Design a protein around this ligand. Structure first.
Ligand SMILES: Nc1nc2c(ncn2[C@@H]2O[C@H](COP(=O)(O)CP(=O)(O)OP(=O)(O)O)[C@@H](O)[C@H]2O)c(=O)[nH]1
Ligand SMILES: [Mg+2]
Ligand SMILES: [Zn+2]
Ligand SMILES: [Zn+2]
Ligand SMILES: [Zn+2]
Lengths: 601, 47, 176, 101, 115, 179, 59, 100, 57
RNA sequence: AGACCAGGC
DNA sequence: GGCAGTACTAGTAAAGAAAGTACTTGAC
DNA sequence: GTCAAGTACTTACGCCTGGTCATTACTAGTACTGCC
């Protein structure tokens, strides 16, 4: 981060949604189609997983933006799955609405006045109206003259309740959503799904639907409707079903019952007024990630392609098998008898491939890890690379004790005093001490190792002589010869001095006083951090080979915190009990018994 | 259980205002506790 | 066809202009804006007038001199909304403009507009009934249907406006 | 400073009306023109949009088409840009609405 | 402290194809700076002081027609104690492609060392 | 995300409220050490007066208001509080919930008010009686917790770190904290 | 070039534009040059003086 | 020009509704340990970027030591915006806030 | 295949032996010391199954 | 980058 | 002199000893 | 509706330093050689 390069906008919020297939054909750089990654002489073949349209790859310019490896951000493409296949993230929630729905009138199997009772309770819970949603049960074989009238009284009660609370300074039209209205929303949807799944007959038109059997993942089975209740299908006047048929059912269910699932699939009020669709549970197009994020595993000559390329190759191999299986249906009884039993076998394996790409444990098959398992645990993405990160400008070495250090300092070696550096922008008051810092060079303490120009350019002092280096010291405080950079000044990456600040840190950091801020005082001899004995009670740090970290902050906002706020003089009292943790330890306590004795004259 | 809270967040279409310190480190905000619990304004002298 | 746009622009403010905030928004954002094309304005910004910095607390008056600028947390710079009235020259298609002649060639008549802005009328925009005589000494003149050299003004309808390059260019046609 | 500024600080360009980190890209300019940052999602093919001569930009393919010039840079960590690439591989659309619009 | 690394020049080929990398110097204009560490056969001398950046072996290449040196990839300086010549065992006799070099590093007891 | 707000009311990061005041008295643990050490603070009165400086801080404060209502509830509670808690028609909030203790001088907790007047009654002892209670009430006010303190982290490190003082017919220790 | 040091972050039009006559432009250009001399826009002032002398005279 | 004008007048009306007036502000009259650490930090970034310094320099070369000196004579032209959890805020200048 | 067992410690068995663990059978003899070197030949191990186990007895 | 092994506090 | 057998080669395809909740299926 | 138990998925201290090994069968092909 450059303090002289501000940034204008800020992410204020995020929200979660599902890529529809129309977006990821417009978003896309190039549809990739053949399951060969790169051909002979190491070139990425056009249309493969490595393509120049999906990013610059291995000293070869991108075909989309025309930039090299260092400046291409990487571009997304897509593949065309021929059959709409299951998204394994949403299969447990698809299978609830796959069940609990009538296969004849395409409502749910509840009565339509009780499904409406949740649509008007969940609309109230989108706004901050947790109280009025229990007053709505107070609005209370049976003819449809009054059930049409009961739905009007429940809906006009909500339209009166929402309009009053939005005028009585309580709820914005973006809706009030707190933690305890998330309680009664998750409680009410779990009441809704548990009551949908427990139905015998559709309570709108009274006849049964054949039940469904979830074998595991990748498959779905409708069970045999019994002989006792096919009579009800005749007085109204087992089989692996396809994934194309499940989408055909649920596109019809979500239109007959759109007015309920706007409030089941939205926590806050739907201001965009978009439909919720059953295509959003399936996936008809896989998004291949950019080739920056799936570079091959390079280790000398042992070049292996990435684990995602090995999973996406099997999806493309199956997608061209099924294209060559549907080329026989255009040719057309035995030629139809065997070609369909292998086509339905190819329906399962392309689902079994889109499982293994997303989730390696929902894939029947030591297995190659999926997209889910690059995120989950320790060594995931959240815990390993977001909540914890490797850092620049930070040191670690063994500690040796040191008195004659003023108890708010750390004793830094010369070898960390030369490598660790700090950007001072030049002013009228630095050109005394920071002109001598640049002249001393990268190896003399106190010195400097780099000059950042006004232009963002960066000049290294490593391969330079002292006569060239005195020329850059007089060029250091000069007015700008560019209008667009007239208010900027040069930054000299000086070495760490006796005035800087340092975070010291020993693992485990079981409490906050195990990571304090020390001043620095360089020492001229050896390669170890040097700590005073009053700090050993807080870090829990003996000297039998302890090494402890050293972080060096890189701006004035963090220098002001590690001197005033996370300072080691502020941490005399721990906040556990209020008892102190800092104090002299072993030789200083046995000396004070002898020094303060009556015998000591 | 990341991709069980991920599915529940996307099936709610849940917007989050980036309030927790965990949510501000993922997206890269200043933390809302301590020093980042206020803004700093500058009194410029002229209109 | 010079027109007045009032704009609202969100700018930066370096710490060296923390004693002169109006002087800094001009020198950083408004002085590099004159005599350039701008997409969110319409044409070429001639100048600006009446700069007002929106104060960050709304409780103050517009009469007050001391205003508030919100400092970025990471960097020492301040961000603010500003109101200013830009004056902008914008050409559009259909309109007819006076053109002072700058280059008479056989392919592209390169002429000026208001002594600043370059324009062009191609040979296919010139009708067939006009001729160009040569200048073997040193760049002659186009002969019109009146049997006379064209010189000085030339009223032409704007065909196309090309703004992607360094300066703006105006394509001109001669049909009406 | 530790968890962002000295680990994976990047100023990535973000589309303001998509809220998308990894959709936008650099346009390929002509001779004399300067390249601009442009979005892929909220753009439109030029044969589909039948123009004002400045919103028209072009790929490296030569695919010249007019659309989204509502983009800006925001300072994010780089692993968030990898988080969107794994969530879009699942089919999850993160939308990053920025405050100055 | 003794540390031994194997310099193997024949791990990028297979099945009797001609060796493109030979130990020794070539005929190009390679810099005379590294006669100090290296002998005429592209092997280092015994006992020479080697810090980081110094060459440890020179080899002539054929697909690039240039003498590349492999260098000392360690930031702690050493002395070269012995150089072995690991000849390959085969029925046809082969030019050397594998050389084992052993370093020694003076670990005088500094402070921070555990006793 | 649990932290002190500027309401002196500690709460979660999304805005929901965990407590109305930190510990019921809003004072920092790293400042309440010598708060009830009254015989220490009396012997060191003229040296503690240099760091709290009472008369220099009268101007930016309200001294008159919170001390009156601290006497209308101390006198009310000594008259009552023979009956148990369910019988108490309370009629008066504590002075620490009606007034901001970081702004009003004299808005203290009740056991700080009861222990000050117990010290100031047993041993009666050149500093007089009213200068000593007007310095403990500014020491209490300066021992308030600051708004922005990451309290829930501190409260979670005050259990997980002393739990590692146990390692490194009722259940006991770290299996009891597991339950 | 093309930085937040140079360009505005966001630019919007507050109101619809309406045209000005020759009198408003020449009152502007006699006030814009006066408030600017009394900086690399001197090359733009050189192009502003061409337009200021065009509506008043002839080159 | 019509959508942005209405959006600007909503952006500036709600931000006026959140603005607690100066007579009706109720937070602490002391500058907390966090407000002192950011006033000295945000000013020291400005001093290092050639902002005008209001105090006489006695040979100080550290921008953070100059910021500590400007706070002692109350010469820092900064304002703390103390946010409340409603989204509302107060405005406290550094000259108003008394230290320790 | 016996040089692979010694260099890695992995037990590749089609009819898995009477052993609970499947990896970690061979260990580099250090010669970092002679106290270290003779200690490799007197050590017993219970099995790597028992290592990844939260019992004490 | 993984797996296993050997360690440090 | 040229035919066919082997021995290789490089080529492209398959790989049994922890404790908690949530859930469906399950008799009645 | 119902309690009921079986089943399924889920976590299990922090940081640091070394070292090693890492696809295999086979299958069709071009070439080597023994032969008549
Ligand atoms: N978080 C962890 N810390 C550890 C672990 N093993 C050791 N340690 C740290 O190492 C230290 C080990 O201390 P010792 O085993 O030497 C007990 P000892 O009698 O030698 O203490 P002294 O009497 O003070 O010498 C202790 O301070 C722990 O904080 C571990 O597995 N996890
Ligand atoms: Mg130790
Ligand atoms: Zn690219
Ligand atoms: Zn039905
Ligand atoms: Zn867009």
């Amino acid at each position: 981060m450059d303090i002289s390069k501000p940034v204008g906008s800020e992410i204020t919020s995020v929200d979660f949604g599902i890529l529809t297939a129309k977006e990821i054909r417009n978003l896309s750089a190039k549809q990739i189609t053949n399951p060969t990654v790169l051909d002979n002489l190491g070139h990425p073949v056009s249309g493969g997983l490595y393509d120049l349209a999906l990013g610059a790859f291995l000293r070869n310019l991108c075909s989309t933006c025309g930039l090299d490896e260092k400046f291409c951000p990487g571009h997304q493409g897509h593949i065309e799955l021929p059959v709409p296949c299951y998204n394994p993230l949403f299969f447990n929630q698809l299978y609830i609405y796959l069940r609990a729905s009538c296969l004849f009138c395409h409502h749910f199997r509840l009565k339509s006045v009780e499904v409406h009772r949740y649509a008007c309770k969940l609309r109230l819970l989108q706004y901050g109206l947790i109280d009025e949603s229990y007053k709505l049960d107070e609005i209370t074989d049976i003819s449809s003259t009054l059930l049409n009238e009961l739905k009007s009284k429940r809906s006009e009660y909500v339209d009166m309740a929402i309009a009053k609370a939005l005028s009585d300074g309580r709820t914005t039209e973006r809706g009030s959503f707190t933690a305890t209205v998330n309680d009664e929303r998750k409680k009410l949807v779990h009441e809704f799904h548990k009551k949908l799944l427990s139905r015998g007959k559709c309570d709108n038109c009274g006849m049964f639907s054949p039940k469904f059997r979830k074998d595991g993942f990748t498959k779905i089975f409708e069970t045999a409707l019994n002989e006792k209740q096919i009579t009800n299908n005749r007085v109204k006047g087992s089989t692996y079903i396809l994934s194309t048929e499940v989408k055909n059912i649920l596109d019809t269910v979500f239109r007959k019952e759109q007015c309920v699932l706007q409030y089941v699939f939205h926590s806050r009020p739907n201001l965009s007024r978009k439909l919720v669709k059953a295509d959003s549970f399936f996936m008809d197009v896989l998004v291949v990630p950019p080739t920056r994020f799936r570079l091959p595993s390079k280790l000398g000559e042992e070049v292996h392609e990435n684990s995602q390329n090995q999973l996406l190759s099997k999806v493309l191999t199956t997608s061209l098998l099924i294209r060559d299986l549907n080329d026989d249906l255009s040719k057309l009884l035995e030629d139809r008898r065997v070609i369909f039993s292998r086509l339905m076998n190819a329906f399962v394996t392309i689902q079994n491939d889109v499982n293994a790409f997303i989730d390696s444990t929902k894939a029947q098959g030591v297995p190659i890890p999926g997209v889910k398992q690059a995120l989950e645990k320790k060594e995931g993405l959240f815990r390993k690379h977001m909540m914890g990160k490797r850092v620049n400008y930070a040191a670690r070495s063994v500690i040796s004790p040191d008195p004659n250090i003023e108890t708010n300092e750390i004793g830094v070696p010369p070898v960390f005093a030369v490598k660790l550096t700090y950007p001072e922008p030049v002013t009228a008051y630095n050109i005394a001490e920071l002109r001598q810092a640049v002249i001393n060079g990268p190896d003399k303490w106190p010195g400097a190792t780099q000059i950042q120009n006004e232009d963002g350019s960066l000049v290294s002092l490593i391969g330079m002589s002292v006569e060239q280096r005195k020329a850059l010291a007089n060029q250091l405080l000069t007015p700008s010869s560019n209008v667009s950079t007239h208010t900027l000044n040069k930054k000299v990456y000086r070495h760490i001095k006796n005035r800087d600040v340092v975070l010291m840190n020993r693992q485990p950091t079981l409490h906050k006083a195990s990571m304090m801020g020390h001043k620095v005082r360089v020492l001229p001899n050896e390669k170890t951090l040097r700590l005073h004995y009053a700090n050993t009670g807080a870090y829990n740090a003996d000297f039998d080979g302890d090494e402890m970290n050293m972080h060096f902050p890189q701006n004035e906002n963090a220098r002001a915190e590690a001197l005033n706020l996370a300072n080691t003089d502020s941490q005399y009292l721990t906040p556990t009990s209020g008892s102190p943790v800092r104090g002299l330890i072993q030789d200083h306590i046995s000396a004070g018994v002898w020094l303060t004795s009556k015998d000591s004259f | 259980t990341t991709c069980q809270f991920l599915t529940k967040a996307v099936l709610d279409n849940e917007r989050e205002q980036l309030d927790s310190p965990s949510a501000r480190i993922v997206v890269g905000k200043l933390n809302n506790v301590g020093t980042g619990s206020f803004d700093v304004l500058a009194k410029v002298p002229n209109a | 066809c010079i027109v007045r746009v009032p704009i609202a622009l969100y700018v930066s403010l370096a710490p060296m202009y923390l004693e002169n905030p109006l002087q800094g928004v001009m020198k950083q954002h408004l002085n590099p804006l004159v005599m350039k094309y701008n997409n969110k304005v319409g044409g070429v910004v001639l100048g600006y007038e009446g700069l007002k910095i929106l104060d960050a607390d709304p409780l103050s008056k517009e009469d007050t001199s001391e205003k508030l600028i919100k400092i970025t947390p990471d960097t020492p710079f301040g961000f603010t909304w500003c109101h200013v009235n830009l004056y902008v020259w914008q050409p559009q298609v259909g309109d007819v403009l006076e053109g002072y002649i700058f280059i008479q060639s056989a392919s592209h008549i390169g002429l000026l507009i208001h002594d600043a802005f370059n324009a062009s009328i191609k040979k296919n925009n010139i009708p067939v009934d006009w001729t160009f005589v040569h200048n073997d000494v040193e760049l002659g003149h186009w002969v019109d249907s009146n049997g006379e050299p064209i010189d000085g003004k030339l009223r032409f309808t704007v065909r196309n406006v090309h703004t992607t390059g360094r300066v703006v260019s105006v394509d001109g046609t001669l049909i009406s | 400073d530790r968890l962002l500024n000295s680990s994976d600080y990047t100023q990535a360009s973000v589309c303001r009306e998509c809220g998308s980190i990894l959709t936008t890209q650099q346009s390929v300019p002509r001779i004399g023109s300067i390249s601009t940052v442009c979005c892929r999602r909220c753009s439109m093919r030029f044969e589909d949009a039948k123009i004002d001569d400045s919103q028209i930009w072009e790929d490296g393919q030569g695919n010249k088409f007019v659309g989204g010039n509502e983009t800006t840079t925001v300072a994010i960590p780089f692993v968030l840009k990898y988080l969107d690439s794994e969530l879009s591989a699942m089919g999850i659309r993160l939308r990053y609405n920025v405050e100055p619009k | 402290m003794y540390k031994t690394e194997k310099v193997d020049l024949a791990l990028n080929r297979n099945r009797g194809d001609p060796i493109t990398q030979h130990f020794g110097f070539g005929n190009d204009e390679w810099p005379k700076e590294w006669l100090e560490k290296l002998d005429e056969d592209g092997l280092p001398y015994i006992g020479t002081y080697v810090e980081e950046g110094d060459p440890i072996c020179a080899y002539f290449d054929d697909t690039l027609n240039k003498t590349k040196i492999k260098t000392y990839h360690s930031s702690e300086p050493a002395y070269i104690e012995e150089v072995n010549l690991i000849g390959d065992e085969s029925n046809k006799f082969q030019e050397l492609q594998t050389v084992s070099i052993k370093y020694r590093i003076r670990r005088t007891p500094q402070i921070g060392d555990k006793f | 995300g649990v932290h002190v707000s500027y309401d002196n009311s500690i709460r979660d990061a999304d805005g929901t409220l965990v407590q109305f005041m930190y510990g019921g008295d809003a004072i920092d643990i790293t400042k309440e050490s010598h708060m009830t050490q009254f015989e220490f603070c009396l012997d060191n009165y003229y040296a503690l007066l240099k760091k709290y400086n009472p008369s220099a801080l009268i101007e930016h404060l309200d001294v008159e208001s919170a001390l009156k209502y601290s006497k209308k509830t101390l006198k009310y509670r000594k008259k009552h509080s023979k009956e148990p808690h369910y019988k108490q028609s309370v009629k008066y909030d504590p002075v620490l919930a009606k007034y901001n203790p970081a702004k009003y001088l004299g808005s203290v907790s009740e056991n700080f008010q009861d222990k000050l007047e117990s010290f100031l009654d047993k041993n009666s002892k050149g500093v007089n009686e009213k200068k000593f209670r007007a310095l403990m009430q500014l020491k209490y006010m300066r021992s308030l917790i600051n708004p922005g303190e990451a309290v829930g982290i501190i409260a979670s490190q005050s259990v997980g770190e002393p739990s590692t003082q146990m390692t490194l017919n009722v259940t006991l220790g770290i299996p009891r904290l597991r339950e | 070039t093309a930085t937040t040091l140079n360009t505005p972050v966001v630019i919007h039009a507050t109101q619809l534009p309406q045209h000005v006559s020759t009198d408003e432009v020449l009152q502007f250009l006699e006030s814009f040059i006066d408030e600017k001399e009394n900086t690399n826009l001197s090359s733009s002032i050189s192009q502003l003086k061409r337009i200021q002398r065009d509506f008043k005279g002839l080159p | 020009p019509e959508d942005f004008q209405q959006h600007e007048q909503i952006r500036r009306k709600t931000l006026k509704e959140k603005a607690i007036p100066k007579d009706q502000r109720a937070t602490t009259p002391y500058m907390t340990k966090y407000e002192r650490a950011r006033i000295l930090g945000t000013r020291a970034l400005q001093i290092s970027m050639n902002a005008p310094v209001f105090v006489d320099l006695e040979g100080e070369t550290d921008p953070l030591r100059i910021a500590m000196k400007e706070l002692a004579e109350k010469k820092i032209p900064l304002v703390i915006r103390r946010y409340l959890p409603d989204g509302s805020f107060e405005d406290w200048s550094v000259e108003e806030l008394i230290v320790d | 295949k016996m040089q692979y067992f010694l260099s890695t410690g992995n037990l590749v068995s089609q009819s898995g032996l009477d052993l609970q663990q499947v990896s970690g059978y061979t260990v580099v003899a250090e010669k970092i010391n002679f106290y270290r070197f003779i200690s490799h030949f007197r050590m017993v191990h219970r099995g790597s199954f028992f290592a990844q186990l939260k019992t004490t007895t």
